[PDB]
Amino acid sequence: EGKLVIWINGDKGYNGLAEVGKKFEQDTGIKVTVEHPDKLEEKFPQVAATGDGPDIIFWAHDRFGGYAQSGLLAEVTPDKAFQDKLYPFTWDAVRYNGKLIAYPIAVEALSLIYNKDLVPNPPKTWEEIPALDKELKVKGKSAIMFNLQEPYFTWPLIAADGGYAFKFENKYDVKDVGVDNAGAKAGLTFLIDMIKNKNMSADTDYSIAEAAFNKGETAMTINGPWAWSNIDKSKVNYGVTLLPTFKGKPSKPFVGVLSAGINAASPNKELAKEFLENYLLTDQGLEAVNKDKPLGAVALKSFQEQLAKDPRIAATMDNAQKGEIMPNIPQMSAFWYAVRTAVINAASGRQTVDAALKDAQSRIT
């Protein structure tokens, strides 16, 4: 009691957040400690269920329905004046069983990131990437590398031709799942065909793809706003644009709302509210995080007005509008674990595309 412990993922601007924490302490005398444990989103329910854990947890909103269902989050209590400072759809992302159970911070979607000096006119279709790769391979380069280990990054292609997670009835139907329909299989088959053709490698992960793109070894990558800061520091002149289409249809990234939840076991709920409402969710607080690692579009209208001019943010929102907001229901983690296994198994040859996605469908439903 008398201090704040915050958990945030290691790809986010945790040093910038710590600067907001230092300002909070200067003003209040209350110490703010920012940590970025690994697997924090799996650890939180295990420690919060014993009355331990951080005061504030940051993640995309998809995890938070499961937390709320288990009673691990405090209902947040912003007055109507504060609610009107943030975009309504961001509050919708953090509403569960009619209650607000987090503060929305930022809106994330994946984009195509391209080296302007290797591909001045980036490909508009996935289908043209193999021919581009062939020309780059004679120069000792590759067309594209992105994280193939996490389903977040492959989902936009799987969804393009008709894949979906849970069907929404204007409630989600947790038994109407679109992981093994024909559209999902078509997109995952194309990924596997690129791997078979040696346009990509099944073992590429986040670090490998980031290093290759930021050293000028691959012409394109797929990543979110948090990655831009490291590219700024690199030698690469990059642009951010629409994901390629597949079978003429847009890639459909899942849209995540970075959210801050208050632990139901926290003895510091009033302090957490003060920190989040009056320090973090200000133009200056978000600026401090954003200059560390970019947040994307932000939930705070006044600061989003200042970011909306950036072509990178425009591209982020263009991809977001072609995609879908993630569900926040508890079943979302089952979806992600099952799809992760399916993609890895298909890409490594441990299962056919059809067998992998059928097994995932069975697991989720």
Ligand X SMILES: OC[C@H]1O[C@H](O[C@H]2[C@H](O)[C@@H](O)[C@@H](O)O[C@@H]2CO)[C@H](O)[C@@H](O)[C@@H]1O
Cα→Cα distances 92→39, 104, 145, 304, 322, Å: 26, 9, 34, 18, 18
CB 276 within 8 A of CB 103: yes
- The residue type found at 206 is Y
Nearest residue to 298 via CA among 225, 240, 230, 239: 225
Q: Which is closer to ligand ASO, CB of 281 or CB of 347?
A: 347
- 43 is a contact residue toward ligand ASO (CB under 6 A): no
The site partner of 11 among Mg ion, ligand ASO, ligand X, none (C-beta below 5 to 8 Å per kind) is: ligand X
Q: What is the DSSP string of 262-286?
A: EBTT-S-HHHHHHHIIIIITSHHHH
Altogether, the residues listed in the chain come to a count of 365
DSSP bridge partners of 166 = 177
Closest approach of Cβ 113 to ligand ASO, in Å? 21
Segment lying near ligand ASO (by CB under 6 A), choices 69-77, 78-86, 147-155, 307-315: 147-155
Q: Which is closer to ligand X, CB of 205 or CB of 359?
A: 205
Q: Which is closer to ligand ASO, CB of 39 or CB of 80?
A: 39
Q: Which is closer to Mg ion, CB of 60 or CB of 257?
A: 60
Residues lying near ligand X in the complex (CB under 6 A) are found at: 9, 11, 60, 62-63, 108, 150-152, 224, 256, 336
Draw the binding track, 98-137, toward ligand ASO (x: CB under 6 A; -: no contact).
Answer: ----------------------------------------
Closest approach of Cβ 205 to Mg ion, in Å? 7
Q: Which is closer to ligand ASO, CB of 189 or CB of 348?
A: 348
Q: Which residues contact 136 (CB under 8 A, 6 or more apart)?
A: 118, 142, 143, 218, 219
- Tell which one of 25, 35, 42, 75 touches ligand ASO (CB under 6 A): 42
Interhelix angle for 151-160 vs 332-348, to 10°? 90
